[PDB]
Amino acid sequence: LPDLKIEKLDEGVYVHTSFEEVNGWGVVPKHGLVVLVNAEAYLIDTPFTAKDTEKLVTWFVERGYKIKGSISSHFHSDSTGGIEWLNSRSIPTYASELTNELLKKDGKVQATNSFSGVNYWLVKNKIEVFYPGPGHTPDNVVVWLPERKILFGGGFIKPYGLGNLGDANIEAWPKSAKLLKSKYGKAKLVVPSHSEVGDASLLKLTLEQAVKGLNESHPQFEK
């Protein structure tokens, strides 16, 4: 597996990329963010492993930016894998009430802090968590950075295929995607879990991919 990567996306916004091997297919990249706010650091999604989470946190902490919290966008391990490590270090972790209930049901360690409702400000004026409704999973949320107009979309953003439908709600996804598109059409950058970073157009494709999945009711390179 490739080493953890950290790449600048905007002033005070970094994409962290961690990797997981899929059996006989290959390595798949997972994107999250580190957002620097008021000279402190916040994780948007954790890496899959405690090792990568520790590497990521210590990297910023050593250099003078205290880790103040992490928010996980949904219950899947690619978003929550580092919660155990963070809790073990007394670093505040956050996830929605729905996400914590799914973690609990799945026998996974929960975030220390939860929230509910459509909007939740993790940092006032600077980090907003938004629940568009069920889609990729029943609990999926997105994270908005109003100062940079950057949206972390995570697994909800599926411009080129809905992917693993094991936990998806194909019935609700179109309505959720419509709501998200209407809410953050102003986004300059949209960050998906695996696919390439794009512009607000990703919100359109997702929507059309949702409405097209309903009807018909790792990446796939075969063509």
Please give the positions annotated as active site: 74, 76, 78, 136, 164
Contact between 155 and Zn ion (CB under 5 A)?
A: yes
- Give the span between the Cα atoms of 177 and 162, in whole angstroms: 12
Q: How far is the CB of 14 from Zn ion (least distance, A)?
A: 21
Tell me, letter by letter, the H, E, C secondary structure of 155-223.
CCCCCCCCCCCCCCCCCCHHHHHHHHHHHCCCCCEEEECCCCCECCHHHHHHHHHHHHHHHCCCCCCCC
CB atoms within 10 A of CB 84: 17
Annotate each residue in 56-95 with x if it binds Zn ion (CB under 5 A) or - if it does not, as one string: --------------------x-------------------
Closer of 69 and 154 to Zn ion (Cβ): 154
- Gap between the Cα atoms of 126 and 43, Å rounded: 13
How near is the Cβ of 39 to Zn ion at its closest, in Å?
Answer: 32
Number of residues that bind Zn ion (CB under 5 A): 2
Asked if residue 65 lies in contact with residue 41, where contact means CB atoms within 8 angstroms, the answer is yes
Of 106-135, binders to Zn ion (CB under 5 A) are none
**Given the rule CB under 5 A, which of 8-16, 17-25, 26-34, 148-156 is the region that contacts Zn ion?**
148-156
Of 37 and 52, nearer to Zn ion (C-beta) is 52
For residue 30, state whether it binds Zn ion (rule: CB under 5 A).
no
Say if residue 211 is exposed, middle or buried (CB neighbours under 10 Å; 0-12, 13-18, 19+): middle
Rounded to the nearest whole angstrom, what is the least distance from the CB of residue 172 to Zn ion in the complex? 15
Interface residues with Zn ion (CB under 5 A) are: 76, 155
